Design a protein around this ligand. Structure first.
Ligand SMILES: [Ca+2]
Ligand SMILES: [Ca+2]
Ligand SMILES: [Mg+2]
Ligand SMILES: [Mg+2]
Ligand code: NA
Ligand code: NA
Ligand code: NA
Ligand code: NA
Lengths: 232, 5, 232, 5
């Protein structure tokens, strides 16, 4: 695309600059360009990709929620403008999710052989189908939800076989899968069970960790705990 | 309902 | 442009929705479309236009400052990437300023006959030349600075003849002109003198105000005071 | 150096 003429290393460098400048749309465009170079991504590069699109779609989701709430209050006298503008933001959000899912499908996942990369990408696939499900209405809502569930489940299966229970990727996957259960799949009991089991198995493995990894793992465990406190 | 950072 | 097919009232409505969603690029595009309908703007519409572009260029300026600082630290070993990306953001910033200045020149200012509209637009013209001056280097820097000064000065002349000293437009103009003097024109004494005289003349006029206008005026006076405390 | 809101 428009990044085809830029060096891979230059794209990564500029993604880091864009992150420092809080220019997340630029950051995502740079990382998309890096992915399209066709080489596998390092751990640091995967995190740059995730941070960029998380912030872009995060802004879209927040905007969509504001507009959706105004629209439903409008239906509890005006014309079509609120619906039109909510639809505009929704279409842009869906476009970003489709872009991320397209990168994962072409061809990040199929080249990801190590547990840390494969689980990372499958978690991302679950996440961006989950964002699609947040705005989906009706029947293809069902198929989107199942695509998220399938991606998360495959990621979970690998992480349980290949990663210790304190691994931050494994913890973040379980956190997000539990949010999927609670918010999307209308399965709060499954959400609570997953979050509790994940927390407890990580707690029993903390003794193996260095001080730095201990900090990394307990930060995500706190997120699980925060959700359980909200949910129970 | 918080998701991963 | 791309908003040519949308009703003026619909554009204004969507600008307000975009503001609620903190979608300031959308907000600015909607307000640009409204301006290009060719009718004069009401007080509320002028403020929507100002809020939208202030937030858009504000993000660009913040990013440019981050990248500029990295670039100068880089020149106190890498390649061209920091300069290239700073230039990219700088060009986008200049494009937004040129867009705003083009709206003012075609044809908001020439149709603005009332003091409140004319001072508002001339202040905006000073502001966006000031943002151009922040990134300008060298000789046309001189001409940009003089365009900002000229716009601010004309706005000041009108505001002193036509508005009371507590008028929030007059106060905000004097605040921004004082920042121009301090940050752009290398005239800190003129900045301090302007801020002090503005503050003192507003103080002596507060007794004329309702409780609501009193609140509006003293909020901007606090900004003048904050700068004077920083500068003296 | 704060400018107008
Ligand atoms: Ca729209
Ligand atoms: Ca660049
Ligand atoms: Mg190459
Ligand atoms: Mg019409
Ligand atoms: Na895929
Ligand atoms: Na591989
Ligand atoms: Na003009
Ligand atoms: Na007029």
């Amino acid at each position: 695309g428009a990044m085809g003429s830029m060096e891979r290393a230059s794209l990564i460098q500029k993604a880091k600059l864009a992150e420092q400048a809080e220019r997340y749309e630029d950051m995502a465009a740079f990382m998309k360009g890096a992915v399209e170079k066709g080489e596998e991504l390092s751990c640091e590069e995967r995190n740059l990709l995730s941070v960029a699109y998380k912030n872009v779609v995060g802004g879209q989701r927040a905007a969509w929620r504001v507009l959706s709430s105004i629209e439903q209050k409008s239906n509890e006298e005006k014309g079509p403008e609120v619906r039109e503008y909510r639809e505009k933001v929704e279409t842009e959000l869906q476009g970003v999710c489709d872009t991320v899912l397209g990168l994962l499908d072409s061809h990040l996942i199929k080249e990801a052989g190590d547990a840390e990369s494969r689980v990372f990408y499958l978690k991302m696939k679950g996440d961006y189908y989950r964002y699609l499900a947040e705005v989906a209405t009706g029947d293809d809502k069902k198929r989107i939800i199942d695509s998220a569930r399938s991606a998360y489940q495959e990621a979970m299966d690998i992480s349980k076989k290949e990663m210790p229970p304190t691994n931050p990727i494994r913890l973040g996957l379980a956190l997000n899968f539990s949010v999927f259960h609670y918010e999307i799949a209308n399965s709060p009991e499954e959400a609570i069970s997953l979050a509790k089991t994940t927390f407890d198995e990580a707690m029993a493995d903390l003794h193996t960790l260095s001080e730095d990894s201990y900090k990394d793992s307990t930060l995500i465990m706190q997120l699980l705990r925060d959700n359980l406190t909200l949910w129970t | 309902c918080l998701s991963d950072h």
